Amino acid sequence: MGLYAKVVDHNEVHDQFTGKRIYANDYNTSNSDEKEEFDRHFYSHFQDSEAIESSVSCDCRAIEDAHKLGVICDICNTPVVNTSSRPIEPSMWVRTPKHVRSLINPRLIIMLTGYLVTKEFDFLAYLTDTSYRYDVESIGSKETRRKVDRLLHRGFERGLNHFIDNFNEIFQFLLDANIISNNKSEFAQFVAQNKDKLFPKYLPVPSKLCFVAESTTSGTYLDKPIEAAIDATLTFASIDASSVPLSPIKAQNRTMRGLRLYGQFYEIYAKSRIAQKPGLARRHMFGARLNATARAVITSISDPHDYDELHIPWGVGCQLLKYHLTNKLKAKFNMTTREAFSFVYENVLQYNQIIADLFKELIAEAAPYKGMGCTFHRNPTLQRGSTQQFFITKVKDDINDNSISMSVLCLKAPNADFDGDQLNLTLMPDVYLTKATERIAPHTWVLSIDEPHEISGNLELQGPVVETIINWAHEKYLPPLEEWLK
Amino acid sequence: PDPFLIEKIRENTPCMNPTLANGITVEHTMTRDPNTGVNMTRRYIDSLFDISSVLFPDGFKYEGNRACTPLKHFEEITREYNAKRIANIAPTDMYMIDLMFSYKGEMLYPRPMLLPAFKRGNMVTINGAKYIGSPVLTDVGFSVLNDSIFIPFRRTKLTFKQTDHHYMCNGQRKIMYVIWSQIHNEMARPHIESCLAHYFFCQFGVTQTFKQWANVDVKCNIYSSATEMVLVIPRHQESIFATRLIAGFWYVVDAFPMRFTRPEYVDSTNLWRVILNIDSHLHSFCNSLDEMTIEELKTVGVNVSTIWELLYEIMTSLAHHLYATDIDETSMYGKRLTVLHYLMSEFNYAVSMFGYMFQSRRDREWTVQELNEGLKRSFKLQTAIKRLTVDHGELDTMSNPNSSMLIKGTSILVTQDRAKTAKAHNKSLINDSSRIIHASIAEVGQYKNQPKNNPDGRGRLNMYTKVGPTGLVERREEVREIIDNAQLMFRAK
């Protein structure tokens, strides 16, 4: 049915939080205590380049225990949740100052920045805040100069409250003459349908995990886009951190400055930390760094076997089937789990009969299958046969064999040759996943995807076998038919 | 094996070059004179300071440099620096010198510095990591590229390109090449480019330029624009250089001429500068020629003594390399195997910047305190080393699982573009007339030795290459014969 974007009413999100709501307006900063509290709420800190030991902790690094789950820390008034499973919620909130009508939706700001903001002139800035300096004669363009002249002749008030209150007429004027000049129907319909959601009272400042500061020798590493966001929040702080209270015009100007900083931050972050080749959407949202996965050089078995048969070696079998071996050790022998891990890790680089028997019994207990179902990947993934299902059948007793006996027949489906190439192996942790992967099993690439009734050329026998068959069948071991009859 | 067989194999086998097999970087960096015990790096530093000494305020003599005692080396490496005597425990093969200046016979604070201290086989250890130092195959005085004459200076990396332009002579249209060169880095009505004749007219008057650089006169045969002003030249005193000047003049005038009202102002200088007023840039361009460039140009076959002589030679004698070049970018003969100029790029830049920012302040009296502050802010401990592992592409990481330095260690060459490596570029190396087959590879470099760095033969170094003093690639005569024939076939049509 599709997947479209929907404008979110920040007021509804603010009302549905129902927790500890702390606002960024009330950080006067300029002193150690408030700056440190702001750095605790913001600025996810990593003090040293070392692996942390707190699996479960509060916002503060004081409750290092994990049994205290859901306990509200008195220092922070925040419950203790798993660090890895920490909910991703807006770190702070920003409300309208005492002399500002409301806040403009950052999506609306970004949408209006594409058209209103121009190199020669900033239409949105001129329309919203008063402390904007411009020279009409300095406009080096003609279309922009005409747009500026028309806007000046129309004569709107340059206050944020006026812009918010009379947004309908201002937006209609922006539509009318030349100011956007394109996508008028869609943008007008969008404004007409979602008018109420474009001016929320409250605005969320994103999660602590969004912003990372890593302190180490030679300083504190940060990112570039985060900077913009920081400024935005700081701007709202400066709205209330004033010795002399600001006039309503100054408050509107500072609010617009903060909102523009937010819009620039979101635009830059979407362009850089999502859109780029390394990022979030194209790097983690569509697969990254599986668990229960191995990678090894493919050395195979030239023996009578099955095509859906794989031979994972001793070290790969021990590390990959770590918890299977732990379960077998605990079930059979009176061994604690610590002793199980010690035994398994101790006997990765060494051979014994017990763990080999455990592998054999695991593969046997995988009853309605040749072994343990798994997926095997060759890079780059071009064809259907680049990824194929196999069944693990035996860990190799030779510790020196860091090899993977994939079938000879399934070699041609990828471009796999035994010239020193490492391929990837993912262990299927479920029967449902094995049944799902059965659609990626090798018997799916037998029939050619480019010929109506022909078996794909990937099933052709390899070189040595074909040459053996030739030297056997095409031999003159009998006289011709006439001489044979006579 | 039969010892006599091995003896006969040795007799019937040409030996390699001990200059190249043991490490050419070793010879060009860590070789001591017998008369005085001084490394090649120390002598290079002295040469650089002696070149830059023209910019001293009459008394700031550069005495030289000494070798620092390991007592002082350790004391200087590990300083207090806010109550933390920080020391970096690592092999970090280095050695310390100290540069000493003198002012009116009295010593200043010596400035210590660190230097790589190459080992045999082009091997260094920096911060505990083993690096290989490869030479860079550089053009001696200037390179000729696809359509360009590329000349590097101590500061700038200039390129001389050319285009075509039209002018009317005796009422008939004629076409001449205009040679231009962008020099104002901030630079990056029809859009045109900074012609060399434009620089001539910006410095000297048009009539002055013509009289000084040719036996040609100017009025205001007849030369005129295409699509006002009239330049009349004596019927018999004509030259290609004068025609090129005319073409450049009309190239700069035809598109602009809203600032040309009275043609006599063309004989001035401020008008031309306005057309191009960064007099600091103009003065830097005028005094932008140094001794090393002059020596290299003399070696190549040019007689430059002033940058304007260089522009005249390019406009008249070296312009032949821009349209139909006798030499070719594809070859590798007549090239240097430079090591120091790329290793000490950081130090060269630091010395240049020190000299320029020291002369540009004032010409008044200099106090010892201010001189010491400038030396402290200019010549630090790791001036020439902070960027060795990140900014220099000639220092690679050693990953040789062999006892032989020839196969991977000592037989690596690096092209200039790959030598900088700060660009992080990929020219795709296919649509390039630079990477064409040439017989030079067979004598310089190793064909059939094709790493993914340079899949052609220029990536590695032929170990039998005849290289004379100062790292100039000489040509062995005998094989040259065969090589010559091969080259003809490579250009068979």
Partner: protein, 286 residues
């Protein structure tokens, strides 16, 4: 101034402181014014112026740084952006899941510590856990359970496992203490909030690795056993507050400490019992 611042640029540084930017300017202015213015012167111339111075101053302041070296802001340039920071976790989550599923049983772990433990004590401790799991777990309980159960369950896992696993391990440790004869400490296992010459010699023999100490006024001082300071920490934690006993009635009667008021009075000679428990653990381990 513004312008210056613007111019310048701024740077870052500024921012550083915081602040914002705006404021610054104012402051510056104031310063210037114051310072310057015042112073110056014016016148013168010379011186210067014023313016210048213022311017220077403013420038210076603005620046400062320059001046112044540290505490400066540097914008790192980030084989992706989320995994661009080198900060890992010390423990694999699968190990923690395995330790949870392990600590969910008590009979096996208890027999791993001591084969000669009646199952009736285990059943009583589990029945008491069924009521005690509502309340909170306090540091002395965790410390004692870590001490008693390390031949079968790792100590550090107590800081990663869930609350039910900790309660079951407390039950197992209490059963082990009750069987061994240290009933007083066993009483202090499932609870709600509300060194002599011979001991020193034996503990030094059992724990030959002792913490070195600073020389006082130049003259070097003898080292102090780390087990001794651990015992002191446990003693202080137990004497920190008063307690309400939630455990087996038989153990409470055997403890020889009965109070009409619903308070668990700490015996005067409890540090000696803890020292005896640590000595027994040391003898069992080596």
């Amino acid at each position: 101034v513004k312008f210056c611042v613007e111019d310048e640029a701024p740077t870052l540084a500024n921012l550083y402181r915081g602040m914002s930017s705006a404021e610054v300017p104012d402051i510056l202015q104031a310063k210037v014014m114051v310072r310057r213015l015042t112073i110056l012167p014016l016148n013168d111339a010379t011186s210067h112026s014023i313016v210048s111075n213022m311017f220077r101053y403013v420038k210076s302041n603005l620046n400062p740084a320059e001046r112044s070296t540290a505490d400066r802001v540097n914008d790192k340039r980030p084989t992706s952006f989320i995994e661009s920071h080198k900060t890992k976790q010390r423990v694999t989550p699968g190990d923690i899941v395995a330790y949870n599923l392990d600590a969910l049983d008590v009979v096996k772990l208890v027999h791993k510590i001591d084969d000669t433990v009646p199952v009736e004590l285990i059943q009583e401790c589990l029945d008491c856990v069924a009521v005690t799991a509502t309340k909170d777990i306090y540091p002395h309980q965790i410390l004692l359970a870590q001490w008693v159960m390390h031949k079968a369950f790792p100590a550090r896992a107590f800081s990663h496992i869930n609350k039910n696993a900790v309660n079951h391990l407390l039950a197992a440790a209490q059963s082990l203490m009750w069987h061994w004869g240290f009933q007083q400490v066993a009483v202090f296992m499932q609870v709600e909030l509300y060194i002599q010459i011979k001991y020193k010699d034996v503990m030094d023999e059992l724990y030959p690795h002792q913490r070195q100490q600073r020389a006082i006024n130049g003259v070097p001082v003898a080292p102090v056993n780390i087990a001794g300071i651990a015992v002191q920490s446990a003693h202080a934690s137990i004497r920190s507050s008063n307690w309400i006993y939630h455990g087996p009635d038989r153990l409470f009667k055997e403890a020889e400490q009965v109070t009409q008021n619903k308070v668990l009075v700490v015996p005067a000679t409890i540090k000696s019992v803890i020292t005896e428990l640590v000595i027994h653990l040391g003898k069992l381990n080596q």
